[PDB]
């Protein structure tokens, strides 16, 4: 996260850390949507261009964390993956379209003050909140500058941006399964996601029932917090049907 700040304890109870067994290192961010399922970005698991292709036994899931590097004994919970599901039509070859993946935890995780799931959006909620100008929240332990990193989980509040403005800012073929966020050059404020924040949650709080809903997934950008550029996120709702499908079947 760039131009963000230290999250407070229990602020993002759904924030998950994808941890690599060997070498032991931060891999990506992810989110808890129930006691057996965590949602993340596909490019975190599969990305041929960089020879990235992890499997169940290569990873560990750490839930309930705040600190980036310490083993928060008695607080965080480490879990093993049982199955990884990459969206069948995930396009890593061209524009990272449908950048989404589901991980099935081996054993259910017990909730607590620091471990709690985030809601997935319904057609109505998404329709009311996913509007240009409306601010959302992003969290992660990723880099703080484009090219030292955070000691503690970071967070930023960014505005959703008009689809047209998103398009005219890149040569990458934008699709309907993705939206962009960030401040515009003259808006005075800045901030963005960055390497290391991938798979992390983009959430919004419903003014109707006060719940937090994950609208997006940290996917891609061009550099970090560059003026004229914006971060892109996977449109959770547009892929909500693939999500449900996976869970009831498996």
């Amino acid at each position: 996260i760039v131009e963000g700040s230290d999250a407070e304890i229990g602020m993002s109870p759904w924030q998950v850390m994808l941890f690599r067994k060997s070498p032991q290192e931060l891999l990506c961010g992810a989110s808890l949507i129930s006691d057996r399922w965590v949602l993340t970005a596909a490019h975190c698991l599969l990305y041929p261009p960089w020879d990235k292709n992890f499997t169940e036994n290569d990873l560990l899931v750490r839930i309930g964390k705040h600190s980036r590097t310490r083993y928060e004994r008695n607080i965080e919970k480490i879990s093993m993956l049982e199955k990884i599901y990459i969206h069948p039509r995930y396009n890593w070859r061209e524009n990272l379209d449908r950048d989404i993946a589901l991980m099935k935890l081996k054993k259910p995780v017990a909730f607590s003050d620091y471990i709690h799931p985030v809601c997935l959006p319904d057609r109505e909620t998404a329709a009311s909140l996913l509007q240009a100008g409306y601010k959302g929240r992003v969290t992660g332990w990723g880099n703080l500058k484009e090219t030292g990193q955070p000691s503690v989980l970071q967070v930023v509040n960014l505005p959703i941006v008009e689809r047209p403005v998103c398009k005219d800012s890149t040569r990458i073929r934008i699709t309907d399964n993705m939206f962009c966020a960030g401040y515009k050059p003259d808006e005075g404020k800045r901030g963005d996601a960055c390497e290391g924040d991938s798979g992390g949650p983009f959430v919004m709080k419903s003014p109707f029932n006060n719940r937090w809903y994950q609208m997006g997934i940290v996917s891609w950008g061009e550099g970090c917090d560059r003026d004229g550029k914006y971060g892109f996120y996977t449109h959770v709702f547009r892929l909500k049907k693939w999500i449900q499908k996976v869970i009831d079947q498996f």
Binding site: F19, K21, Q24, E25, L26, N57, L60, R68, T69, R70, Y71, I78, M80
Partner: peptide, 10 residues
Amino acid sequence: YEPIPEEFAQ
């Protein structure tokens, strides 16, 4: 990073 207990390396 601070090493994590080996009981979670399967």
